[PDB]
Design an enzyme around this catalytic site. Sequence first.
Site, mmCIF file in Angstrom:
data_model
loop_
_atom_site.group_PDB
_atom_site.id
_atom_site.type_symbol
_atom_site.label_atom_id
_atom_site.label_comp_id
_atom_site.label_asym_id
_atom_site.label_seq_id
_atom_site.Cartn_x
_atom_site.Cartn_y
_atom_site.Cartn_z
ATOM 1 N N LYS A 160 -0.140 -3.494 -10.323
ATOM 2 C CA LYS A 160 -0.850 -4.719 -10.669
ATOM 3 C C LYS A 160 -1.579 -5.314 -9.472
ATOM 4 C CE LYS A 160 1.731 -6.610 -14.586
ATOM 5 N NZ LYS A 160 2.543 -7.759 -15.080
ATOM 6 N N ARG A 161 -0.968 -5.225 -8.297
ATOM 7 C CA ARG A 161 -1.568 -5.769 -7.090
ATOM 8 C C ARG A 161 -2.706 -4.906 -6.560
ATOM 9 N NH1 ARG A 161 0.187 -9.859 -9.309
ATOM 10 N NH2 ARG A 161 2.474 -10.226 -9.187
ATOM 11 N N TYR A 162 -2.762 -3.664 -7.023
ATOM 12 C CA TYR A 162 -3.802 -2.740 -6.601
ATOM 13 C C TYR A 162 -4.474 -2.070 -7.801
ATOM 14 C CZ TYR A 162 -2.112 -3.206 -1.833
ATOM 15 O OH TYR A 162 -1.777 -3.708 -0.579
ATOM 16 N N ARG A 163 -5.197 -2.846 -8.600
ATOM 17 C CA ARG A 163 -5.839 -2.288 -9.792
ATOM 18 C C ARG A 163 -6.971 -1.313 -9.480
ATOM 19 N NH1 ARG A 163 -4.777 -6.545 -14.202
ATOM 20 N NH2 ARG A 163 -2.760 -5.408 -14.156
ATOM 21 N N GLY A 186 -1.141 -0.035 13.439
ATOM 22 C CA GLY A 186 -0.335 0.430 14.551
ATOM 23 C C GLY A 186 1.070 0.766 14.107
ATOM 24 N N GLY A 189 2.949 5.494 10.062
ATOM 25 C CA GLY A 189 3.776 6.630 10.416
ATOM 26 C C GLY A 189 5.210 6.212 10.671
HETATM 27 C C1 LIG Z 1 -1.490 2.212 10.416
HETATM 28 O O1 LIG Z 1 -0.746 1.378 11.378
HETATM 29 C C2 LIG Z 1 -2.012 1.229 9.386
HETATM 30 C C3 LIG Z 1 -0.850 0.447 8.696
HETATM 31 C C4 LIG Z 1 -1.385 -0.568 7.698
HETATM 32 C C5 LIG Z 1 -0.482 -0.774 6.509
HETATM 33 N N1 LIG Z 1 -0.824 -2.100 5.998
HETATM 34 C C6 LIG Z 1 -0.100 -2.943 5.233
HETATM 35 N N2 LIG Z 1 1.146 -2.652 4.798
HETATM 36 N N3 LIG Z 1 -0.665 -4.116 4.907
HETATM 37 N N4 LIG Z 1 -2.666 2.088 8.389
HETATM 38 C C7 LIG Z 1 -3.841 1.964 7.820
HETATM 39 O O2 LIG Z 1 -4.642 1.054 8.053
HETATM 40 C C8 LIG Z 1 -4.093 3.052 6.804
HETATM 41 N N5 LIG Z 1 -5.403 2.870 6.110
HETATM 42 C C9 LIG Z 1 -5.468 1.906 5.102
HETATM 43 O O3 LIG Z 1 -4.455 1.232 4.787
HETATM 44 C C10 LIG Z 1 -6.629 1.627 4.337
HETATM 45 N N6 LIG Z 1 -6.559 0.610 3.329
HETATM 46 C C11 LIG Z 1 -7.654 0.140 2.469
HETATM 47 C C12 LIG Z 1 -7.038 -0.425 1.194
HETATM 48 C C13 LIG Z 1 -8.497 -0.938 3.201
HETATM 49 C C14 LIG Z 1 -7.780 2.372 4.714
HETATM 50 N N7 LIG Z 1 -7.763 3.310 5.714
HETATM 51 C C15 LIG Z 1 -6.600 3.529 6.403
HETATM 52 C C16 LIG Z 1 -6.770 4.543 7.457
HETATM 53 C C17 LIG Z 1 -6.776 4.050 8.817
HETATM 54 C C18 LIG Z 1 -6.958 4.941 9.909
HETATM 55 C C19 LIG Z 1 -7.136 6.348 9.703
HETATM 56 CL CL1 LIG Z 1 -7.354 7.270 11.121
HETATM 57 C C20 LIG Z 1 -7.137 6.880 8.332
HETATM 58 CL CL2 LIG Z 1 -7.359 8.546 7.980
HETATM 59 C C21 LIG Z 1 -6.948 5.955 7.219
HETATM 60 C C22 LIG Z 1 -2.597 3.026 11.145
HETATM 61 N N8 LIG Z 1 -3.175 4.066 10.630
HETATM 62 C C23 LIG Z 1 -4.099 4.575 11.533
HETATM 63 C C24 LIG Z 1 -4.153 3.848 12.714
HETATM 64 S S1 LIG Z 1 -3.075 2.564 12.707
#
Ligand SMILES: *[C@](=O)([C]([C][C][C][N]C([N])=[N])[N]C(=O)[C]N1C(=O)C([N][C]([C])[C])=[C]N=C1C1=[C][C]=C(Cl)C(Cl)=[C]1)C1=N[C]=[C]S1
Length: 237
Positions: A160-163, A186, A189
């Site tokens: 619901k939060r991600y339609r 950050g 992983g």
């Molecule tokens: C991760 O530290 C972050 C953690 C954020 C989780 N956020 C939360 N619970 N509110 N990861 C990302 O940002 C992963 N990511 C995304 O979440 C999105 N979201 C959309 C909906 C805007 C888009 N793209 C990514 C993403 C970021 C970076 C890479 Cl290199 C790739 Cl392939 C995808 C980190 N992940 C990478 C660096 S810090």
Amino acid sequence: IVGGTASVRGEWPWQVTLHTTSPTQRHLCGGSIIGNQWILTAAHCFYGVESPKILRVYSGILNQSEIAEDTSFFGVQEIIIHDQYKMAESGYDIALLKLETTVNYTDSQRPISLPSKGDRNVIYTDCWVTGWGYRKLRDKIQNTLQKAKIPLVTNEECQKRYRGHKITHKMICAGYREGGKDACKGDSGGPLSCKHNEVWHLVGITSWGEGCAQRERPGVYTNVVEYVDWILEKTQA
Ligand SMILES: *[C@](=O)([C]([C][C][C][N]C([N])=[N])[N]C(=O)[C]N1C(=O)C([N][C]([C])[C])=[C]N=C1C1=[C][C]=C(Cl)C(Cl)=[C]1)C1=N[C]=[C]S1
């Protein structure tokens, strides 16, 4: 981590900080020790990463400042990304790091137990997300490892939060209806650790979400229990 607090040293002994040495050394992502030479983390953390040669895994770290040129680290021999992974929001955001040497378990560094398939009906009520990630949308890596308790939400609710997305059963979400506490840039992983029956279980892997700690926008995590066979397969020599 947004809305969290400083961890106690050794409190999350399976938590590692994954650094890249290119162009200059810096924290890249979080990760979890699940084996004496295996780090479980997120596939998307390797966008652009062409070789394991530029990776450095540091265990038993509380403060990033502990990390200097003379600090020991584990080299990465192989990066194993799920062949079904394409992007974080689509799923299969999971990866294994085979270290060049074995981790000597101790109070500062030990492996976290993987969830059991029979543990798919368990309700984890004591889950925490940890990392050196952003505290604010536009911030920077934090020196001290942060922690935040965050309740899990059903996939139906997460949906619901991600339609605009498809929340699959290989994903698990966590967050507060009013936001305030969540993983951020950050923390990717890193582990979503849930304590059940006096034992910590790696329930999820910090994957993605829209913004950070926003209201009605749970963090989305890889649902680890769905990958135990994959993990056995890829780690079994
Ligand atoms: C991760 O530290 C972050 C953690 C954020 C989780 N956020 C939360 N619970 N509110 N990861 C990302 O940002 C992963 N990511 C995304 O979440 C999105 N979201 C959309 C909906 C805007 C888009 N793209 C990514 C993403 C970021 C970076 C890479 Cl290199 C790739 Cl392939 C995808 C980190 N992940 C990478 C660096 S810090």
